[PDB]
Every structure is written in structure tokens, then in C-alpha cells.
Design a protein around this motif. Structure first.
Motif, PDB file in Angstrom:
ATOM      1  N   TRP C 144       0.811  -1.185   0.039  1.00  0.00           N
ATOM      2  CA  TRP C 144       0.020  -0.147   0.038  1.00  0.00           C
ATOM      3  C   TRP C 144       0.990   1.215  -0.072  1.00  0.00           C
ATOM      4  CZ3 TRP C 144      -4.836   0.699  -1.551  1.00  0.00           C
ATOM      5  CH2 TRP C 144      -5.549   1.953  -1.159  1.00  0.00           C
ATOM      6  N   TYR C 186       0.124   6.304  -9.201  1.00  0.00           N
ATOM      7  CA  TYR C 186      -0.625   7.333  -8.829  1.00  0.00           C
ATOM      8  C   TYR C 186       0.002   8.901  -8.593  1.00  0.00           C
ATOM      9  CZ  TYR C 186      -2.145   2.569  -7.097  1.00  0.00           C
ATOM     10  OH  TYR C 186      -2.572   1.433  -6.855  1.00  0.00           O
ATOM     11  N   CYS C 188       0.921  10.835  -6.698  1.00  0.00           N
ATOM     12  CA  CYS C 188       1.200  11.092  -5.505  1.00  0.00           C
ATOM     13  C   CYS C 188       2.888  11.037  -5.510  1.00  0.00           C
ATOM     14  CB  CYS C 188       0.769  10.307  -4.334  1.00  0.00           C
ATOM     15  SG  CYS C 188       1.394   8.443  -4.428  1.00  0.00           S
ATOM     16  N   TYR C 193       3.945   1.423  -8.197  1.00  0.00           N
ATOM     17  CA  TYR C 193       3.696   0.439  -7.165  1.00  0.00           C
ATOM     18  C   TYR C 193       3.264  -1.052  -8.037  1.00  0.00           C
ATOM     19  CZ  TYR C 193       3.288   3.954  -3.673  1.00  0.00           C
ATOM     20  OH  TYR C 193       3.685   4.859  -2.740  1.00  0.00           O
TER      21      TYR C 193
ATOM     22  N   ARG D  55      -6.739  11.139   0.420  1.00  0.00           N
ATOM     23  CA  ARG D  55      -5.505  11.658   0.578  1.00  0.00           C
ATOM     24  C   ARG D  55      -5.535  12.827   1.645  1.00  0.00           C
ATOM     25  NH1 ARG D  55      -3.073  11.360  -4.248  1.00  0.00           N
ATOM     26  NH2 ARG D  55      -3.960  10.128  -5.962  1.00  0.00           N
ATOM     27  N   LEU D 112       2.225  12.277   4.310  1.00  0.00           N
ATOM     28  CA  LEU D 112       1.135  11.835   3.119  1.00  0.00           C
ATOM     29  C   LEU D 112       0.425  10.619   4.205  1.00  0.00           C
ATOM     30  CD1 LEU D 112      -0.834  11.378   1.019  1.00  0.00           C
ATOM     31  CD2 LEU D 112       1.092  10.395  -0.282  1.00  0.00           C
ATOM     32  N   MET D 114      -3.032   7.936   3.169  1.00  0.00           N
ATOM     33  CA  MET D 114      -3.930   7.692   2.310  1.00  0.00           C
ATOM     34  C   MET D 114      -4.825   6.269   2.607  1.00  0.00           C
ATOM     35  SD  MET D 114      -4.118   8.188  -1.682  1.00  0.00           S
ATOM     36  CE  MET D 114      -2.533   9.034  -1.583  1.00  0.00           C
TER      37      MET D 114
HETATM   38  O1  LIG Z   1      -3.700   7.681  -5.097  1.00  0.00           O
HETATM   39  N1  LIG Z   1      -2.344   8.015  -4.747  1.00  0.00           N
HETATM   40  O2  LIG Z   1      -1.770   8.926  -4.691  1.00  0.00           O
HETATM   41  C1  LIG Z   1      -1.752   6.659  -4.068  1.00  0.00           C
HETATM   42  C2  LIG Z   1      -2.134   5.593  -3.451  1.00  0.00           C
HETATM   43  N2  LIG Z   1      -3.399   4.909  -4.043  1.00  0.00           N
HETATM   44  C3  LIG Z   1      -3.702   3.548  -3.607  1.00  0.00           C
HETATM   45  C4  LIG Z   1      -2.187   3.404  -2.821  1.00  0.00           C
HETATM   46  N3  LIG Z   1      -1.593   4.417  -2.958  1.00  0.00           N
HETATM   47  C5  LIG Z   1      -0.015   4.609  -2.468  1.00  0.00           C
HETATM   48  C6  LIG Z   1       0.054   5.410  -1.235  1.00  0.00           C
HETATM   49  C7  LIG Z   1       1.241   6.291  -1.055  1.00  0.00           C
HETATM   50  C8  LIG Z   1       1.356   6.833   0.085  1.00  0.00           C
HETATM   51  C9  LIG Z   1       0.581   6.578   1.365  1.00  0.00           C
HETATM   52 CL1  LIG Z   1       0.809   7.228   2.907  1.00  0.00          CL
HETATM   53  N4  LIG Z   1      -0.536   5.752   1.117  1.00  0.00           N
HETATM   54  C10 LIG Z   1      -1.002   5.126   0.048  1.00  0.00           C
END
Ligand SMILES: O=[N+]([O-])/C=C1\NCCN1Cc1ccc(Cl)nc1
Ligand SMILES: O=[N+]([O-])/C=C1\NCCN1Cc1ccc(Cl)nc1
Ligand SMILES: O=[N+]([O-])/C=C1\NCCN1Cc1ccc(Cl)nc1
Ligand SMILES: O=[N+]([O-])/C=C1\NCCN1Cc1ccc(Cl)nc1
Ligand SMILES: O=[N+]([O-])/C=C1\NCCN1Cc1ccc(Cl)nc1
Lengths: 209, 207, 208, 207, 207
Positions: C144, C186, C188, C193, D55, D112, D114
Motif C-alpha cells: 500500500w 498514482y 502522489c 507500485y 488523500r 502523506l 491515504m
Molecule cells: O492515489 N495515490 O496517490 C496513492 C495511492 N493510492 C492507492 C495506494 N497509493 C499509494 C500510497 C502512497 C502513500 C501513502 Cl501514505 N499511502 C498510499
């Protein structure tokens, strides 16, 4: 001393996992049930949801203190003292404790614990919709402490059965009687005491003949 | 010494994460089920909800103390002890422990733990509504310890199968037989001892 | 001459449950293989399935290795004393119900195995579940919070009988199971991943 | 240093029960939602069941380290960090966190978190079966930290609203808009910020 | 002085398990409920399911500090503070706390804890389908502290009962009155104070 002291000194002498056997005799534990509600009755599976205040009393002299210049009673978290490992033999769900889990401790060592529990039982429900009503029996006693370590006796008190029974429940309590028993199993040669609480109840508003 | 010293020592020498193996022999664990109820049965999905007492026994010599002039049996929270990692291989729900999670320890190191458990299983339910009834088999054995670390055997207790079975249940017990068995996985040669509990039961009826 | 206790103690003193065991920089290579045991609450209208599977998880932390020439080659260890992959079933709609004791198996070479039996609800294609071809429900499991450079997932395509451990009493049967591997990015984190996508082809039993 | 050193420092400097107020400004918490599924709609009781990714980002400079000779970021259990005490105001069931509770901390102090959450909400379900669908509004913001302590704003992106939304849901997203809002309670003169997420969804039509 | 010191000090003086009594006068606790939602109501079993904010306040002098040059308020985990042992005397399900379990502490030792709770109660649901509606009474008070130790009073403040009530509920609030009250149990002498909240509500529906 004050209350902050009483708790401190209780947290010391107390051993929550050490049953306070005095000299060499079972700890006398009193168990009285006060029914508050009957919620889900299933005459087909013989199961009923019950709500009740399980008044439990016993003495732990390792707790006693001098209350001449201090309070005679204080409320203490049960995780800070020894508590009987009671169990409802015919229970089919874990006991849902509805109230704060605090016990009442007197300076002479007398202890009181009265949680409001919500639990489902397997018992005789047939007759619930009849004049005589149904009789559901509940067995409660220690799970691992036999008769020489723990003895359980129903705090005999001629009290109104529906004294605290919700007036809004679909049911009415015809009569409650508390009895004491003793069972010996294969594991061990010693007996396990218990209290059988027979709750006689029926549905309200039934047609008259 | 008194019960406090005993409980003090037990807590001070117990290794809850280390299997109490004396020499090179596995830990001898006895498992015996005593059916207390059969709460819900579904013939179409082959699933049953049952309550039973899981009598479990094993030995841990490090816990032993001299009961010459002191109690030779105390109640102990299982979180303070090593307990066998038993699992119901065909359980479809995690075991709901209905009783105080305390084990009983004898001064010789013998440990008895008998939790009342409610749990659902995936077994043969067909015939539940016939005179022959249905035969649901439940297999219980260690989950991670094989035959050289843990051995499992039924506590042969020639007794009544319905001795503690609820009379208010909708079902009734025809017969219970607990046989010793073993399971093995493709990957490896090691085997895991278990106990197969066959519950022959049926819905109460007079027709 | 080390007993299981000494083995556990060395592990408890070098293993870091909250620290991922990275070698140099390379990512921790985790193996994920699902073995289905039962299919329960199936709903073609809502497209939801209830499944029980053994989730075989393998990885390695060589810092936990020992000499087993004259000592046990393996020991059972509570996962709480170990670092365990933060895996998640992306299309799950209920938190996993772990049915087995949460113990892992650590081997003398530093290999760690964890195989919990899990009951969990999933959102997947359930249509055609009652057709000869059946339905194909895809389950995606992966870290995750650890990206491809910190953790990588490899479907241990250890060719085996898909319904080897599958309940015979289930109302369904397994036609075929396929272990796939994917990667996602993603908004972020720049790097992707990794995940393993398990395709489960099952259908309602019935002589015909 | 290594990841273990970083986690060691964090555990040292971090005070999970203390809000990381920089200077004396409020902590800026960005909150954004990514709907994954819609499960138990009931147009009669106006209740819905929803699975979404929350998020959540913010800063805690007292966690920063020199990533010159170390990794830039690590995964950390949220129990080791201060986390915004966010509550979905119209939720009627506690949040069911479906994912491992690890946050991501960057070298500079950026955090972060999520989690994928499943929760039941009380909101407008009327018209879910119509073509224009329904619009359920979810309000999320700090529970005990007012405007001068925490500020929440919806950090939108270029992602499609149903970019991660399950195609197997009986429902489909028609639109999602996230507005920042502010309420004052009898409690105190200062108001509390919250993001109000509007989800316009409808039951999928037929062929 | 920053927030780190305020919490640090609280951790040094706070006795979560000792009732903060001034001399020998009982601790003055104020209770008042703010109804948010009415989710389920059974006209036949006389049972309701509701969501409400339980605004609770009391004084804990040993928590006071000087805010002349620091914040006069901080959010603190209720597990670091003594909390009133309140219980709903007629509840048939234990309270499902929907929000972060954090209290608010003022530099003068005043504490405010307002959790949003979803809970099931046994009360009069008759007339709920009529214009005058039904009147469900909820009694809340200490479970173990009698009057000399704890007193409970309603925050009698003229206001809008439906102020924060859900517009999407199938019901509507007609009026909410909160009266002080006491209960003595046969056994013992001392009485237990409680607040009697009367919720007059009805099913909403133009007809
Ligand atoms: O949508 N995103 O930006 C990111 C993710 N979506 C599902 C798993 N994911 C990766 C992720 C990165 C950091 C954190 Cl704190 N939790 C999950
Ligand atoms: O019925 N009673 O005797 C007493 C009570 N009934 C409800 C609350 N109550 C007060 C009370 C006292 C001590 C303890 Cl340990 N628990 C509850
Ligand atoms: O059936 N038995 O042999 C024994 C018992 N059945 C119900 C309670 N009981 C007593 C008991 C003794 C020791 C332990 Cl560890 N657990 C329960
Ligand atoms: O499939 N297998 O190889 C092995 C097993 N399947 C179910 C239990 N089982 C035994 C086992 C081995 C290692 C671990 Cl860590 N846990 C359980
Ligand atoms: O009604 N109010 O006065 C206040 C509030 N209602 C919902 C959230 N809220 C803010 C708040 C303040 C103090 C505490 Cl202890 N908890 C929550």
C-alpha cells in the motif's frame, strides 16, 4: 489521606490475577441478577437477547484501608483488581458490557461490581406467547475456579422482579427465582458452583379467553 | 509459598512465544471437543454455526513448582503462557471465545485450557433433515508446527456425546467420533497432526 | 547448540517490525500466492464475492539467519516481532478476517514465510457465475505504501491444482486461476507500485 | 544514515499527541477524496455505504532529517506520528480503515496518509434511480481543532472522478466537486474548517 | 511555553482514575445532548437508534497552567484525563463513539468533551406516527459515583433543538427538554444524579 492515596495504595497491594483466598477457604462471591429488558426472542431457535445488571459482590481484604480520615469508598477500574471469572454457561454471545467498567471498593475490603450486560442465551423460550409464559434459565458461575477456590451464592433479597424492568419492553416478567447448584466434570474431581436464574416471562397484550 | 508467589514465578519464567519442547520430542497436545449447541445450519451452503468446549492439554515443565506446602493449581491468563497455535482447517470464521481466557496450571507443569467457542464451518450438511442425519467433520491441528514440533491426539474420554449438548437446540447429536489424523502440503514432506471430529447430527423431529 | 529460544531471541534483537529490510538499496522481493479454500456469499446483482484463501507470503531478511547444522532450521514467530509487507487487497470491500494464529515461520537462511488464512469480501465481476464459462473475479494484492523500488511482488506461479485445497462443500467450483503481475502510478508518487492480479474463474456447481 | 536510523529519530522527535504548529500559524491539512465504490444505497432512509481513499497531507517540520546520505522518504505507522483528528460529520458508522495504517514521511517533513475507508453516511439519496442521479454531500474536518489551529482545503487534481472507481459497482459517478467550508459553534467564537465533498451518482441504466 | 509543555505537564499532574474532587464537594459535571440524527425507530418494540453530540464539561484544577504567554487551550486524548463515568440508564447497545476521542482543556482546568455517539435506546415510541409525535426519554448519569461525589446538570440554554439535526432524517424534532433528576437504589442510601433528556419527535410526512 485522600482518594489519590487510596488508589495508589490499592494499585500496590492488589494483584488482579491473584484470587484473594483468605487463609484457606473459597472466596465468597454473590451474584444477583436484575433484569432490565428482553429484546429479541426467537421461539424457533430458542434464543433470547437479555439486558441485566449483574450485581456482583465479594471481599478482598488485601484492599482494605483506614477510612477514619479518608473516604470509606472509591471507584476503581476493574483492571486494577482481582475479579471473578464468571461465565454464563448457556450464553451464545460474548457479554456486551454497556456501562463504564468501574467497581466499588469499601475500606474494609468489600467489593461491588455491577455492570449492565447485554447477552444472547440458548434456553427454553417456548410458551413465551401463552398465559404461563416461557421459562428461560441462565447458568452463571466461575469458569476455572472450583468450589474450594470460589463459591457462588445468589444474594437472597426479596426484591420486586420487574423493579427495574423497562415498562416499554414487549415483555413482562412473570417471576424470577435464583437458585444455587454444583457441577462436577471429567477434567477435575472437584465441584464447580453456579447460580441458576430462572426468568419466567411472556408477551404482553395477549388475548383473553 | 502462596498463590501470588506461584503466579509471580509462572509470569517470570514463562516464554509465551517459545514452544516448550523437552529434548527433541514434540510437545504432546491433547484436544477434545464437547458440543454445547448447534445454532444455525444451512443445507444448501453446507455451513454450520456451532458452540463447543475445546478441552486442550499440554505440558510445560519450566512452570512446575513444589506443591508440598502450597497450592498445586492456579488459574492463569493465557496471554502469560505459550499456547498451541491450533486452527480449524475448515472454519469459515475466526473462533469466538465466549469464556474468560484463563488456563489452569498444575504444579507439575501440566496446562489445561478449555475455552467455550462459537465458530462457523464449511462441512457436509446434507441429510441433516433425515433419520440418518448429516455428518459434519471438523479438523483441528497446529497451523505452523509440524509432527516433529507438535503432536496432536484426541483425549480419549469414553463419555456421552450429548452430555453437555443443549436440550433447547433445534438439532440433536447422533454420534461424535474424534479420530487422530494428519495433513500434508505439496511443497513439503512435513506433516501436521490434527483431530477429525465427526459430528453426526440431525434436526429434531418425530416424523 | 542453539535452542528455539536462543533463535527467537536473536531474531527479536535484530528484526525491526517497523523497518523494511532493504539490502543496499535493492527492493525487498516479496512473493504472493493465493490458494483458494472456499467461495461463500456470491451476489451477481451487487457484484460482490466472499472468499477464503490461504495467502502465501514470502520474503527474506538475511540479518536473521543462523547456523542450523546442529540446531532447528525453522521456528514460528509472532508477526508482531517481525517486519511484514504492508500488503492490501485493492478491490476488497471489507477488512480481512484472519482466521489463523498470526505466526510466521522464519528459516535459518533468513527466509520468512507467513501464510494466514483469510476471509474477505471483494468487488469484482460476478456475471456469468452460473454459466459453463463462469465468472472471472480479479483480485489485486500489493503493497500500500511501498513503491516498486522498495517492494516488488512476484506471483509465485508454482503451477499447481487450483482447487487442490478448495472446499468440496462449497456451492461453487474453480475452473481456473491465473497469477498476473502489474504496475500502477498514482498522482502522489513518481515511481510505480507493483501488484499481483489473481484471476479467479469459478462457477456454480450442478450436474449437467 | 539508514531507514532504521530515520525511523529512530522520528520516534524520538515526534510527539503524536501534539499538533505541529509552525510559528503560531495553523497546520494546513489538505483533504481530498477518491471514490472507489458505492455499496448500500437506500433512498428511503437516505443512507449510503461508501469506499474511498482519503488523500491527507500536512507538514510537521519536527520530523525532517538530512536526506543527503539517506533515503528521501519512509513508511511510518501512524501511531508514531501526530495525525489530524478528522471526522466525517454526517457519518453514521465509525470509519472502517481497510488498509495498513502507515503514513509516508518525506525528508523535509511532508506527511502523506491515504487510507481506504468504508463508511456509512447520512445524506441526500433522492433521485439515485433517476437520470440526473442523487447528490450526497460529505463533510470532513477537524473535530476539536478550530480555524486558528487547523485549516483544511481540498487539493484537487487532474484525475478523473471515477479514475479508481470500481466498474462493477451498481452505481456510476456523474460528478464530484469538493468545496471548502467553515462553521461556528456555540463552543467558541472561532469557527472550524471542513471540506464538503459532493458526490453526484446514479444507478446504472439498462441495455 | 508551547503546546508540548502544556501536554507534558498534564501528563505529570493528571490522574485519569481519580475523581478530581475539590475538598469534599462533588465534581460538577454538565451534560446536554445535541441530536444529529434518528436512524431507526420501532413502533412495536419501543426502540430507537440515534446520533447525538454529548456536550460534557467539568473542572479539573490539577490541569491548570499559565497561558499568559502560551495557548490557553489544547486538544488532549481522554485517556490522559479523568472522565465522568456517564452511562445511559436506558440504553440497549453500548455507545458507538463516532469521533476522535479528544477532549479540549482550557488553561483554567475546564474540560470539554463532545463526542458524537450513535446508540440504541429503550423508550416510548408510541404516537411517533401522529402530529404530536412520540416522546422518548433518555436518562444519563454517573454509573458508580453517587451525589456527594458527582452532580449532573443540564446546560439549560435556550436554543434550536433541530439546529444540527439532519434534514435527511425520516423524522423531525418537535422539542427537546432536559431536566435534572435523581435515582436512589433500594440497597444503599445515597442517590445517583441524572439528566433526563426528553426527545419529542415524529415521523415527517405531509398528509
Ligand atoms: O492515489 N495515490 O496517490 C496513492 C495511492 N493510492 C492507492 C495506494 N497509493 C499509494 C500510497 C502512497 C502513500 C501513502 Cl501514505 N499511502 C498510499
Ligand atoms: O441497583 N443498584 O443497587 C445500584 C445501581 N444500579 C444502577 C447503578 N447503580 C449504582 C452502582 C453502584 C456500584 C457499582 Cl459497582 N455499580 C453501580
Ligand atoms: O468440561 N470440563 O472438563 C470442565 C469444565 N467445563 C465447563 C467449566 N469447566 C471447568 C474448567 C476447568 C479448567 C479450565 Cl482451564 N477451564 C474450565
Ligand atoms: O501450503 N503450505 O505450504 C503450508 C500451509 N498451508 C496451510 C497451513 N500451512 C502451514 C504453514 C506453513 C508456514 C507458515 Cl508461516 N504458516 C503455516
Ligand atoms: O457544538 N459545539 O459547540 C462544538 C462542536 N460541534 C461539532 C464539533 N464541535 C467542535 C468541538 C469543540 C470541543 C470539543 Cl471537546 N469537541 C468538538
Amino acid at each position: 489521606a485522600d482518594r489519590a492515596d487510596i488508589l495508589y495504595n490499592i494499585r500496590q497491594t492488589s494483584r488482579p490475577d491473584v484470587i484473594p483466598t483468605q487463609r484457606d477457604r473459597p472466596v465468597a462471591v454473590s451474584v444477583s441478577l436484575k433484569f432490565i429488558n428482553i429484546l429479541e426472542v426467537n421461539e424457533i431457535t430458542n434464543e433470547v437477547d437479555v439486558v441485566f445488571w449483574q450485581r456482583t459482590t465479594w471481599s478482598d481484604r488485601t484492599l482494605a484501608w483506614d477510612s477514619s480520615h479518608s473516604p470509606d469508598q472509591v471507584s476503581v477500574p476493574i483492571s486494577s483488581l482481582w475479579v471473578p471469572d464468571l461465565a454464563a454457561y448457556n450464553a451464545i454471545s460474548k457479554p456486551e458490557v454497556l456501562t463504564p467498567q468501574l467497581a466499588r471498593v469499601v475500606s474494609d475490603g468489600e467489593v461491588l461490581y455491577m455492570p449492565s450486560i447485554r447477552q444472547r442465551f440458548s434456553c427454553d423460550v417456548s410458551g413465551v406467547d401463552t398465559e404461563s409464559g416461557a421459562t428461560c434459565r441462565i447458568k452463571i458461575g466461575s469458569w476455572t475456579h472450583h468450589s474450594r477456590e470460589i463459591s457462588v451464592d445468589p444474594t437472597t433479597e426479596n426484591s420486586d422482579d420487574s423493579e427495574y424492568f423497562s415498562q416499554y419492553s414487549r415483555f413482562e416478567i412473570l417471576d424470577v427465582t435464583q437458585k444455587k447448584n454444583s457441577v462436577t466434570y471429567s477434567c477435575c474431581p472437584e465441584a464447580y458452583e453456579d447460580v441458576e436464574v430462572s426468568l419466567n416471562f411472556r408477551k404482553k397484550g395477549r388475548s383473553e379467553i
